[PDB]
Structure 1
């Protein structure tokens, strides 16, 4: 039979893995491979490492192991083809422009080597290219048009069966005694990160964590802004959780809870915004840039290195903004409303810095942000693309006050401000000296003064946006 390699990139799971099913079918031998390539934050890397460890543990239960190989796929796969005598290579499709070109090169090489290639598109709900075909060979640039297209398309494919124990026993690969020395999942130190006092990850990686969270998930305040134990978005981004499994379990719950067996599209709204951005990005190599991006409004943003760095580090002097950016840096996830506040502050609201710089910082820190979804949300938020009708105004003080009147969210991530009363914690520069000394926090010494006058900068910025449009 076949000597198969399943290539993990996304789709870091055994459930709903049709590409892995294709590798297993009629195989004498199967080897699951992740290729580690020797800017990116520690939370992203730790999440990846934990997901790979989970896969290795899962494969141990099926009399197998994960093969983590270091190098570039273009160099690695020829050596592996010859060394393992591979006859079949399978992986989950990657719609993103860079991944498409990489994968096309691997497939052409595997054809020239005589190796069979199978790909499955189980990272998304739909065939993105089919959506583009039905829209006249262009991606839809509004969510309303995107929703009209998929409403007439056939439902997403149901989640595939996870591979059997008997299937994996039929093609167990020989594991050498030094497998961990050659193919082991590296540690954070081995990736170049010294671990100085790091506590348990707020977002533990892996398919097992993903499936446990899904079960609890199907069972606005300060608590709403905290990381939730039923949160699923990092697991969808890495593929620890199948989006089609989520889609249909969500549907099953709707039918059990409500009478109708016809749920509104908004119940899938998060999956559909995901899907919409993937559709728009797949044929646009410049999706995450302004210049040369055919869907992006050209806007003369300011270059402001100091303000950009202060925003990125949570040193703006607006506690709402700084607390969000602190949560993002420390944990790797922030609420969508917090993303609004922080993106609008950087771009059209206050700093007039390009959404491209926001994409870069979020790419480094945000666990659920990939090329398509990150850049898409930033162009959408900053009114650079997707036919944005009105400019949503978020005050870096009032929106925080409205979302968490208690101020405890600030107190959690900015402990230096813990002593400020709720009436001042979003604008501590307005606290009298006596209040600042009682809180043991002198504005301008212990915590910075606000770096902009929001009233004045927001007025100038909203007029520039009107003139541009």
Structure 2
């Protein structure tokens, strides 16, 4: 019969999946596949929390497919290796994917599309990771993506209204389409565990950010209620509680496709109309989505978007190379408790607040260590659940004054910012247990504590907790000057 395969990469959901919906139509069998390669050299920089989040998305998908009399098929290897075999073994005639705007993904998908054509397989591609056809936004701007958010906003408002989300894949939608299943499915196609990827899990705490569509859809409602409670759709002022992972947080779910950006858009729209009594919302309502769309648009036609050299939009700043200073930053042993707490939260949980990101990124790059944004990007890629190629590269260039016309950022103080955010130091004591004995007077600068205070705290600076790795006052003075000199002669660095 007509045997269809839908290939999950992002778009890890059954709601608003136009590619899956179209593939099922007119099909006699359907098999949803995810191609997992945990040992791939290109994925050697993926950390354990990202693996766990992915696996939990896959377990969620498999569970929801069970309800529809189907299963997720997890295939190990590379797509170019496995898809020729699958086409023959399953007699496939249709293959669907959600479109991938990222340069490497466009190259991969063009190769699979050629393999599918060679084997007599129809390919269905549908845009749903982003709100818009990014190529149309670029054409509206004259052929190049915009590099300012205000310009991007102007372009977005000129696009045609969003189409309605695709119907959720239910049993009624699946209809006559069935999924052939084997008694040994779990053994041959099951979702692997962390231990099957080679990871120890002994003593590992439960995920602060559980993966999956089901979780994403619950959080969507919490997110909307919080904005309804305050009748304000702008992003809120950060306080110390904002540093903690929130049950309203959506960013990892948008990154993996657990939550449709278009569903988020219409839910926001309907809530604004009800609360504000206005059919015409401001574009600020969609801020989180449009900043995301902005960096996707800037990245799609730039294969060196994640590099400095050979990147047409990036200022060529002479960053220092310092592997040992970089490692102290990445491992949260800088000796500045505010910085180490943030880097520890990041490593332990996979998410940190936007201003916390500014803080640690300023320290690494333009503020204290003068290390390339490319290196902070790589660490965030390993640890940050909501980091993807486009967002991660774009944000690291933004904050390092390397692109997007960004210049005189505030130079964050690795002591004063934390003290002003959380004067009592609860955030420090939560993520840095060894410092719990320090009073608030010294919690952000423990090297200033008298010896008697350190001894009572059972934490000797230089032994139980590191000395500060730099003199922030001198280092920031020199780096502020270096960045001033670069922008005094900016064209010299194009």
TM-score range, shorter chain: over 0.9
Is this contact kept in 2: 1:159–1:244, CA < 8 A?
yes
Partner of 2:29: 29
Is contact 1:125-1:157 (8 Å) kept? no
- Asked if 1:431 is matched to 2:449, the reply is yes
Q: CA deviation at 1:388?
A: 0.9
Matches within 5 A, 1:163-182: 163-182=169-188
Within the alignment, does 1:236 sit opposite 2:254 as a pair? yes
Deviations 1:270-307 (A, max 9, x none): 11111011001111111111011111000110001111
Q: By how many angstroms is 1:61 displaced?
A: 0.3
- Give me the TM-score of the superposition, normalised by structure 2: 0.93
Q: Distance in 1 between matches of 2:291 and 2:280?
A: 20
How far apart, CA to CA, are the structure 2 residues paired with 1:107 and 1:438? Answer: 66
- In the alignment, which residue of structure 1 is the partner of 2:189? 183
Query: Tell me, what secondary structure is at the counterpart of 1:218?
Result: helix
Instruction: After TM superposition, list the pairs within 5 Å mapping 1:39-118 onto structure 2.
Output: 39-118=45-124
Give, in angstroms, the shift of residue 326 of structure 1: 0.1
Partner of 1:330: 348
Flag structure 2 segments of 5+ consecutive residues without an equivalent: 40-44, 226-237, 488-494
Following superposition, the deviation at residue 433 of structure 1 comes to 1.5
CA contact (8 A) 1:19 1:119 kept: yes
State the match for 2:374 in structure 1. Answer: 356
CA shift for structure 1 position 169: 4.3
Query: Which of 364, 368, 384 is the aligned partner of 2:386?
Result: 368
SS at 1:196's partner residue?
A: coil
The whole-number CA distance in structure 2 between the counterparts of 1:380 and 1:188 is: 34
Alpha-carbon separation, structure 2, partners of 1:242 and 1:259: 25
Residue 75 of structure 1 deviates from its aligned partner by 1.1
CA distance in 2, matches of 1:433, 1:257: 57
Runs of 4+ in 1 over 3 A off after TM superposition: none
2:8 matched residue in structure 1: 8
1:402 aligned to 2:420?
Answer: yes
- Taking structure 1 as reference, are residues 157 and 439 closer, same or farther at Cα in structure 2, changes over 3 Å only? farther
The CA deviation string for residues 169-200 of structure 1, in whole angstroms up to 9 with x for no partner, is 41111100001111000010111111121121
- Residues 203-282 of structure 1 mapped to structure 2, 5 A cutoff: 203-219=209-225, 220-282=238-300
* Structure 1 residue ranges without an equivalent (≥5): none
Are 2:469 and 1:451 equivalent residues in the alignment?
Answer: yes
Aligned in 2, Cα 1:433/1:156: closer, same or farther, shift over 3 Å?
Answer: farther
Instruction: Verify the 8 A CA contact 1:62 1:169 in the aligned structure 2.
Output: no
Q: How many residues align?
A: 469
Which of 108, 125, 131 is equivalent to 1:119? 125
Q: CA RMSD in A?
A: 1.1
Q: Distance in 1 between matches of 2:439 and 2:281?
A: 44
Partner of 1:304: 322
Which residue in 2 is equivalent to 1:18? 18
Q: CA deviation at 1:161?
A: 0.9
Aligned match of 1:467? 485
- In the alignment, structure 1 residue 286 sits paired with structure 2 residue 304: yes
SS at 1:435 equivalent: helix
Alignment of 1:381-392 (within 5 A): 381-392=399-410
Q: Deviations over 1:24-50 (max 9, x none)?
A: 101111110000124211100000000
